[PDB]
Write an enzyme that holds these catalytic residues in place. Structure first.
Site, short mmCIF file in Angstrom:
data_model
loop_
_atom_site.label_atom_id
_atom_site.label_comp_id
_atom_site.label_asym_id
_atom_site.label_seq_id
_atom_site.Cartn_x
_atom_site.Cartn_y
_atom_site.Cartn_z
N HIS A 141 0.84 -1.03 0.21
CA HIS A 141 0.00 0.13 0.08
C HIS A 141 0.79 1.29 0.13
O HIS A 141 1.38 1.58 1.09
CB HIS A 141 -0.69 -0.10 1.39
CG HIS A 141 -1.73 -1.13 1.51
ND1 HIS A 141 -1.02 -2.46 1.88
CD2 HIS A 141 -2.98 -1.31 1.54
CE1 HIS A 141 -2.16 -3.24 1.88
NE2 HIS A 141 -3.28 -2.48 1.66
N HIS A 172 -1.69 -0.73 7.29
CA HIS A 172 -1.32 -1.29 6.14
C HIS A 172 -0.29 -0.18 5.31
O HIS A 172 0.36 -0.62 4.50
CB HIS A 172 -2.65 -0.88 5.17
CG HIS A 172 -3.41 0.35 5.51
ND1 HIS A 172 -4.30 0.60 6.43
CD2 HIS A 172 -3.41 1.58 4.73
CE1 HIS A 172 -4.80 1.76 6.26
NE2 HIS A 172 -4.11 2.28 5.09
N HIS A 226 -4.53 3.73 -2.93
CA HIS A 226 -4.59 2.77 -1.59
C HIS A 226 -3.67 1.58 -1.49
O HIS A 226 -3.11 1.43 -0.52
CB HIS A 226 -6.03 2.51 -1.33
CG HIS A 226 -6.17 1.52 0.04
ND1 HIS A 226 -6.18 2.01 1.27
CD2 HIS A 226 -6.27 0.27 0.01
CE1 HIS A 226 -6.23 1.13 1.98
NE2 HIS A 226 -6.12 -0.03 1.41
N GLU A 238 -15.96 -3.78 26.06
CA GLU A 238 -15.01 -5.02 26.37
C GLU A 238 -14.16 -5.06 25.37
O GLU A 238 -12.82 -5.55 25.65
CB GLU A 238 -15.67 -6.28 26.03
CG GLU A 238 -16.89 -6.60 27.23
CD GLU A 238 -18.18 -5.76 26.76
OE1 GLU A 238 -18.66 -5.14 25.85
OE2 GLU A 238 -19.28 -5.93 27.68
N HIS A 275 -26.62 -14.70 27.16
CA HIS A 275 -25.71 -14.73 28.10
C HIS A 275 -24.87 -16.20 28.42
O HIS A 275 -23.93 -16.21 28.83
CB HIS A 275 -26.27 -14.25 29.44
CG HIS A 275 -26.44 -12.79 29.58
ND1 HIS A 275 -27.24 -12.15 28.56
CD2 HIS A 275 -26.03 -11.84 30.42
CE1 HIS A 275 -27.29 -10.79 28.88
NE2 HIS A 275 -26.41 -10.57 30.14
C1 LIG Z 1 -22.18 -6.33 25.99
C2 LIG Z 1 -22.55 -6.62 27.17
N1 LIG Z 1 -21.76 -6.42 27.99
C3 LIG Z 1 -22.18 -6.33 29.46
C4 LIG Z 1 -23.31 -6.73 29.73
C5 LIG Z 1 -23.64 -6.89 31.11
N2 LIG Z 1 -24.74 -5.75 31.55
C6 LIG Z 1 -25.83 -5.77 31.67
S1 LIG Z 1 -26.50 -4.20 31.99
C7 LIG Z 1 -25.17 -3.30 32.18
C8 LIG Z 1 -24.84 -2.08 32.58
C9 LIG Z 1 -25.90 -1.30 33.03
O1 LIG Z 1 -25.92 -0.19 32.68
P1 LIG Z 1 -27.11 0.60 31.86
O2 LIG Z 1 -27.12 0.28 30.42
O3 LIG Z 1 -26.79 2.15 32.16
O4 LIG Z 1 -28.42 0.14 32.49
P2 LIG Z 1 -29.19 0.72 33.84
O5 LIG Z 1 -28.59 -0.01 35.16
O6 LIG Z 1 -29.25 2.15 33.87
O7 LIG Z 1 -30.34 0.05 33.67
C10 LIG Z 1 -24.04 -4.43 31.96
C11 LIG Z 1 -22.43 -4.18 32.15
C12 LIG Z 1 -24.34 -6.98 28.89
N3 LIG Z 1 -25.65 -7.38 28.99
N4 LIG Z 1 -23.75 -6.77 27.40
C1 LIG Z 2 -11.02 -4.13 11.27
C2 LIG Z 2 -10.30 -4.18 9.71
N1 LIG Z 2 -11.33 -4.21 8.81
C3 LIG Z 2 -10.95 -4.21 7.21
C4 LIG Z 2 -9.67 -4.00 6.98
C5 LIG Z 2 -9.29 -4.09 5.45
N2 LIG Z 2 -9.09 -2.62 5.31
C6 LIG Z 2 -7.60 -2.23 5.16
S1 LIG Z 2 -7.24 -0.68 4.91
C7 LIG Z 2 -9.02 -0.26 5.01
C8 LIG Z 2 -9.83 0.83 4.59
C9 LIG Z 2 -9.07 2.02 4.13
O1 LIG Z 2 -9.32 3.04 4.69
P1 LIG Z 2 -8.29 4.23 5.46
O2 LIG Z 2 -7.93 3.68 6.81
O3 LIG Z 2 -8.95 5.51 5.40
O4 LIG Z 2 -6.86 3.99 4.70
P2 LIG Z 2 -6.18 4.84 3.27
O5 LIG Z 2 -6.67 4.41 2.22
O6 LIG Z 2 -6.52 6.19 3.74
O7 LIG Z 2 -4.76 4.60 3.56
C10 LIG Z 2 -9.98 -1.51 5.06
C11 LIG Z 2 -11.33 -1.25 5.05
C12 LIG Z 2 -8.77 -3.95 8.39
N3 LIG Z 2 -7.37 -3.96 7.97
N4 LIG Z 2 -9.27 -4.07 9.54
#
Ligand SMILES: Cc1ncc(C[n+]2csc(CCOP(=O)(O)OP(=O)(O)O)c2C)c(N)n1
Ligand SMILES: Cc1ncc(C[n+]2csc(CCOP(=O)(O)OP(=O)(O)O)c2C)c(N)n1
Ligand SMILES: [Ca+2]
Ligand SMILES: [Ca+2]
Lengths: 662, 662
Positions: B25, B65, B260, B410, B472
């Site tokens: 690239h 890249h 690119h 995460e 879950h």
């Molecule tokens: C992708 C993901 N990560 C973690 C969880 C565990 N989890 C469930 S609710 C929550 C956070 C609670 O936050 P919010 O969305 O602010 O809900 P509230 O307590 O205000 O109802 C988490 C970490 C989940 N369900 N999904």
């Molecule tokens: C997570 C992920 N998805 C897809 C790709 C494939 N890929 C490599 S570069 C690119 C997009 C190029 O965009 P940019 O970051 O704007 O690069 P430029 O062309 O400006 O160098 C993609 C989709 C990758 N490396 N990683």
């Protein structure tokens, strides 16, 4: 009754159902009950007696842990969800599981629980509505016209997928997407300012959304006026930031993280009832409250009116009306199977040594004119994944199109396509390099869990991609898809198996199908008519010996060629060998026992599997007495031909391993 | 030479190396040469003769890249990367792979390629510098003081992980993180306005960053002034938005998506030399250009000054100097092994029936005082994952602390911890429910590929979590970790195996370790001193018969108790049975052949595997004539005791399957 008393019925059912189950989340349902009362009673267009009405508004609970909020709403408004199911919240086989599940409970539009994916699914439902309206509406015959509403919390706003999908929603101007944010300042670890300090309103204005700040989420008049303003903005999605108190009504636990995810306790519930002024015993709702919440009469009137409008549309546009109904049902065109079989037969008769990513584009081109319901896209890899066909029209240019430039947003792409498929009307296909199924992994699992049809096109499937190197060369990803329940995974060895795999994926109605495609060219294999029909059985005898085999090669995709060459070398020395091509292990495992024994006879234990993927998967088919020519390490950056030699994918090493079993 | 001629040296080497490999690239490297020239010649603090200097600034190329950009810079400034390796770009075993790889090429700080993870690792490097400075610097002795610079492109900005880690970087006020955005308007599909329309500056101001807009990326003075300004803002991370032309220099391909990711072509290269005024042949750099780029003299002078500062520091703070040295080497305290062994033996002598998530918190509490290098955290699940110990101090409250509240992020959490591991000085542990390993999956793979120590604590490992339900409850996730090269995965059956797994994880220096922990209580198994020592071998004989077994059970985690109960029933019927506990398949596979045969004799083929996870994994150890008691579908929402019954995890069913082999 006042609006507060009606909203308190949601609070009473939620806290009491969580208490009876001794499990669950009372906090969010109690903090969002006033918002839901306004949305559902004054704006939502739906019919509780027909949860499949095509033109209903779509509601999504993205903060899915607050499941008693949607179960209370469905019960109160008249869906088929009886009080006895609310009393069996979180119990074995009830219709009220801990997180809402589509297809299981009437009125639930998607399965949520994994944070961030419900707002992604709602962006997909809003794209579907917009695109279907552009394709079918005629002036005075607007048969498609519905909103998409979503509730979301701080956890969804923190997740990276909210940035992917809300950024793209702003680009595509989805004015009928209206999202309500539960801005209650609390997450599981405590007060969110120690880990979440974004100016969320400014972030959403940066995505081109319309944003209404500081709505008092416990004041019905304020909420109502905000919904009216959002519905009048037609060219931008809207975000309503509602300031709520988690656990509203609880004297000791409102506003604390203790009301998030555990029962309030009987003593605190008695105090909450008194603070709310709620005088009814657990699971008791007076007649007068049901009468104000029920939506059966209004629901039937609205759907009745739409049926009269659809009948007028079908009298002026009969062909369009029949296509609308076929597509909303997800039925295949009646001539599809015949035309796809003719195309497959033609490829077997006209061999071409081409990459299976190119064979995949040729099948999209052949099926494209037969399936107007295609809505496809790629995560910024259209020229490499080969997902455009001569009829592709991108929906950022033509709203009635059939292709989406998703940008570099794999996880958002896959969960948006799950919302497209749940909406009805379309057959989505999505694509990226196979390595980046790891960015979208849980959205792939969610398609298989929700039993939704989506064709996932993953190209650049092995060390055969060459120089990009080990961050991009898949090793263990295919094995991870193969052990996912309800997932179908195809790794075709040439352009004919590729067309068979595409036909299987578009006809699969109850789950997704991933195609594992090569960057490099693959030789075509010769087949009789019987072998051509067996490709859809997932594994089949491709080369055989006279008599029973002494040795069986099992190979997939690009490695079938290597096993055929090794078969040729051993057969010349007098060995009775067989080659089995196994494009799909899941389709093979579903065949009857006598078919599977006729391909892989239980008496033949000298078995060699050949696949440029992690070796450990293949003990399922070769056992402890076989041999596996596979990868055991990460790859390396070099030209593909050198890598196949370096990692043992050569005719000599395959023959040598086979000979050790003889 | 002018600054432009010095920057053109990068351009020439990059287009010529891509041309020779016929792969790679050239676009980004030509677009970003002028920014790199200013940064590396005028600001970066580094010593090419010692790429491991503890106080060097850290540079991260997130748009990986454009790898020729970093190989050109390392070669030109004096690192050990000769011109012959630049001529072997993308060739087998060269020191210039297609994407940069840490550990293979001197001077490369992390492995990038998967978009968005570079900026995540940079955020972890900036966290590490800040925390290490707070822990070790003293008045008049600032031994830790360095910046973290990152280059990123549109692909990184679209990915969800950039929202996760840049939002958290704003909360943590990382003033020493300075990122440069290559704003060139192009991605692989074409001009980005069809799919990317964010007001990126306003988004980053919403994260609390300092942003400098509209920097002419081809004007050295403008770039220099913007870096000076960002360096003077000490309480917010800075984003420098640099407008550049992709492929700058190429008359016909500059500014197009054609520059690119494919070679420019001989004719185009000739025209580019003419446009740039670059007269030298391929791979020819004149001695005067080397003289202006070389940094060996300045780098040795700055490290020499740091060395004398460290010696003075060690005279004033001898205990802290010794700990700094031990932690930067990654060595364990000399009494750790003995103390950890004493704790393990104490647990075996004092049984307790507790969840392995609680046994994990107990190990953190025992090891915490011995390992001041811990920098742990959970993705908004601290009270469920049990990641806090009595000495945890969060770094949003005290910068010298050892705990990070990551929020619901995460994937950013896992790739930030990878950056903490790469920086040196800490041992990171991260945590969330096991299912959400799918949100962070590629970051977990990158920890393995880069060989970095991180302990990943994943709780709620099966249908034993109960009522939250199928979104879950893990089924196929542990199998996907087990087939990942260089990953170590432990599923301990009680509090003793849990402590041995934590000890194995902190001692593992060349890769990550995931612990798979239960929500529900686990009974403790009795062990002799010999069995207790063999837990660390990953698989061992827990229960045995006299002579060679006729049947062998293999079980892990919460299912070991079921296997032991089945062994007791079968032994009472006179069968010679054995139970093998297998907390880690990867540590077992690394044992020598004699140990593996003693545990799982090849002559015994009646083998039964018992585990609440996807069944197909286990053919590797049970073969085709054995049986597996496992899951083959998604879970359900109900109390755990009822799910184990419904899915066949009962003594009676395990006994029945075993008896079918006899
Ligand atoms: C992708 C993901 N990560 C973690 C969880 C565990 N989890 C469930 S609710 C929550 C956070 C609670 O936050 P919010 O969305 O602010 O809900 P509230 O307590 O205000 O109802 C988490 C970490 C989940 N369900 N999904
Ligand atoms: C997570 C992920 N998805 C897809 C790709 C494939 N890929 C490599 S570069 C690119 C997009 C190029 O965009 P940019 O970051 O704007 O690069 P430029 O062309 O400006 O160098 C993609 C989709 C990758 N490396 N990683
Ligand atoms: Ca919240
Ligand atoms: Ca770009």
């Amino acid at each position: 009754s006042s609006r507060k008393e009606l909203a308190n019925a949601i609070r009473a059912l939620s806290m009491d159902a969580v208490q009876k189950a001794k499990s669950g989340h009372p906090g969010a349902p109690m903090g969002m009950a006033d918002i839901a009362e306004v949305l559902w009673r004054d704006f939502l267009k739906h019919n509780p007696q027909n949860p499949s009405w095509a033109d209903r508004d779509r509601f999504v609970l993205s903060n899915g842990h607050g499941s008693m909020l949607i179960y209370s709403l469905l019960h109160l408004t008249g869906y088929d969800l009886p009080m006895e199911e609310l009393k069996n919240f979180r119990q074995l086989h009830s219709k009220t599981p801990g997180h809402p599940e589509v297809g299981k409970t009437a009125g639930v539009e998607t399965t949520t629980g994994p944070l961030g994916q419900g707002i992604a699914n709602a962006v997909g439902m809003a794209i579907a509505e917009k695109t279907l309206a552009a394709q079918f509406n005629r002036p005075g015959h607007d048969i498609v016209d519905h909103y998409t509403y979503a509730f979301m919390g701080d956890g969804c706003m923190m997740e990276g997928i909210s940035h992917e999908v809300c950024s793209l929603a702003g680009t595509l101007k989805l004015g009928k997407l209206i999202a309500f944010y539960d801005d209650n300042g609390i997450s599981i670890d405590g007060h969110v300012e120690g880990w979440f300090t974004d100016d969320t309103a400014m972030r959403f204005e940066a995505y081109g959304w319309h944003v209404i700040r500081d709505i008092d989420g416990h004041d019905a008049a304020s909420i109502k006026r905000a919904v009216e303003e959002a519905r009048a903005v037609t060219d931008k999605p809207s975000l309503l930031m509602c300031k709520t108190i988690i656990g509203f009504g609880s004297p000791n636990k409102a506003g604390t993280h203790d009301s998030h995810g555990a029962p309030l306790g009987d003593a605190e519930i008695a105090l909450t009832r008194e603070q709310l002024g709620w005088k009814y015993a657990p699971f008791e709702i007076p007649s007068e409250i049901y009468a104000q919440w029920d939506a059966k009469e209004a629901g039937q009137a609205k759907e009745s009116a739409w049926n009269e409008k659809f009948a007028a549309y079908a009298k002026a546009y009969p062909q369009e009306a029949a296509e609308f109904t076929r597509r909303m049902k997800g039925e295949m065109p009646s001539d599809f199977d015949a035309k796809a079989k003719e195309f497959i037969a033609k490829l077997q008769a006209n061999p071409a040594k081409i990459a299976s990513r190119k064979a995949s584009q040729n099948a999209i081109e052949a099926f494209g004119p037969l399936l107007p319901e295609f809505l496809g896209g790629s995560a910024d890899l259209a020229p490499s994944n080969l997902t455009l066909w001569s009829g592709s029209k991108a929906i950022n240019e033509d709203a009635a199109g059939n292709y989406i430039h998703y940008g570099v947003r794999e996880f958002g792409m896959t969960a948006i396509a799950n919302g497209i498929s749940l909406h009805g009307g379309f057959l989505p296909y999505t694509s990226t390099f196979l390595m980046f199924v790891e960015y979208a992994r849980n959205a792939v699992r969610m398609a298989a869990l929700m039993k939704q049809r989506q064709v996932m096109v993953y190209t650049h499937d092995s060390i055969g991609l060459g120089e990009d190197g080990p961050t991009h060369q898949p090793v263990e990803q295919v094995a991870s898809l193969r052990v996912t329940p309800n997932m179908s995974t195809w790794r075709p060895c040439d352009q004919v198996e590729s067309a068979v795999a595409w036909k299987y994926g578009v006809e699969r109605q109850d789950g997704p199908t991933a195609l594992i495609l090569s960057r490099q060219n693959l030789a075509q294999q010769e087949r009789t008519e019987e072998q051509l029909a067996n490709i859809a059985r997932g594994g089949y005898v491709l080369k055989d010996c006279a008599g029973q085999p002494e040795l069986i090669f099992i190979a997939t995709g690009s490695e079938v060629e290597l096993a055929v060459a090794a078969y040729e070398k051993l057969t010349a020395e007098g060995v009775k060998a067989r080659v089995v091509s196994m494009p799909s292990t899941d389709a093979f495992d579903k065949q009857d026992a006598a078919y599977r024994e006729s391909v892989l006879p239980k008496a033949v234990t000298a078995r060699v599997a050949v696949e440029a993927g992690i070796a450990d998967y293949w003990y399922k088919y070769v056992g402890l007495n076989g041999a596996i020519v596979g990868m055991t390490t990460f790859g390396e950056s070099a030209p593909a031909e050198l890598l196949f030699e370096e990692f043992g994918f050569t005719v000599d090493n395959v023959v040598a391993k086979a000979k050790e079993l003889l």
